[PDB]
Amino acid sequence: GSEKRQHSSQDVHVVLKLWKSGFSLDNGELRSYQDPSNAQFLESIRRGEVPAELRRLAHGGQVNLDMEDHRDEDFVKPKGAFKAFTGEGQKLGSTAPQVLST
């Protein structure tokens, strides 16, 4: 976590995950496909334009948005791990009683 340094300009991916309620970005949490504030993301990402949260995540260079599908996984993005286990299956039990070291 950078906290307060700079947004490392190393050309990074902002993951957009598709859920049963909405979508989440690597910068934020799940926003349902209904809310008028999520509409910006939905509309811009629909086109291919960049929501501010992504450019406010990576430096203003290669901010690329990578899409994942999870859907009935509810929401798992900030929670822990990476990609929330999209490797052959989905979440796969999520047997992580802890946040770190797993």
Side-chain angles (χ1 to χ4, degrees), residues 50-98:
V50 63
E53 298 207 313
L54 323 179
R55 236 75 184 201
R56 298 300 190 183
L57 195 285
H59 224 241
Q62 185 178 267
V63 184
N64 190 90
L65 178 149
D66 288 62
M67 278 177 174
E68 281 183 53
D69 72 281
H70 289 254
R71 297 179 296 132
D72 48 75
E73 293 307 295
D74 276 294
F75 178 53
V76 276
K77 156 82 283 291
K79 311 307 297 180
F82 291 100
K83 302 225 299 174
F85 295 99
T86 358
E88 190 56 75
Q90 211 54 269
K91 191 174 81 293
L92 301 177
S94 54
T95 38
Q98 63 292 92

Side-chain angles (χ1 to χ4, degrees), residues 18-55:
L18 138 74
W19 315 101
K20 52 82 70 282
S21 300
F23 61 97
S24 63
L25 328 185
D26 190 54
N27 42 268
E29 300 185 87
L30 185 176
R31 292 181 175 117
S32 310
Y33 299 120
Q34 305 172 150
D35 191 283
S37 302
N38 313 336
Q40 39 124 144
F41 304 103
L42 281 175
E43 215 60 75
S44 310
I45 303 174
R46 197 185 212 154
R47 296 310 303 182
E49 303 180 272
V50 63
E53 298 207 313
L54 323 179
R55 236 75 184 201

Side-chain angles (χ1 to χ4, degrees), residues 2 5-12 57-63:
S2 303
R5 310 175 301 157
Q6 58 174 28
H7 293 255
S8 306
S9 188
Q10 294 182 151
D11 301 271
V12 306
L57 195 285
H59 224 241
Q62 185 178 267
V63 184

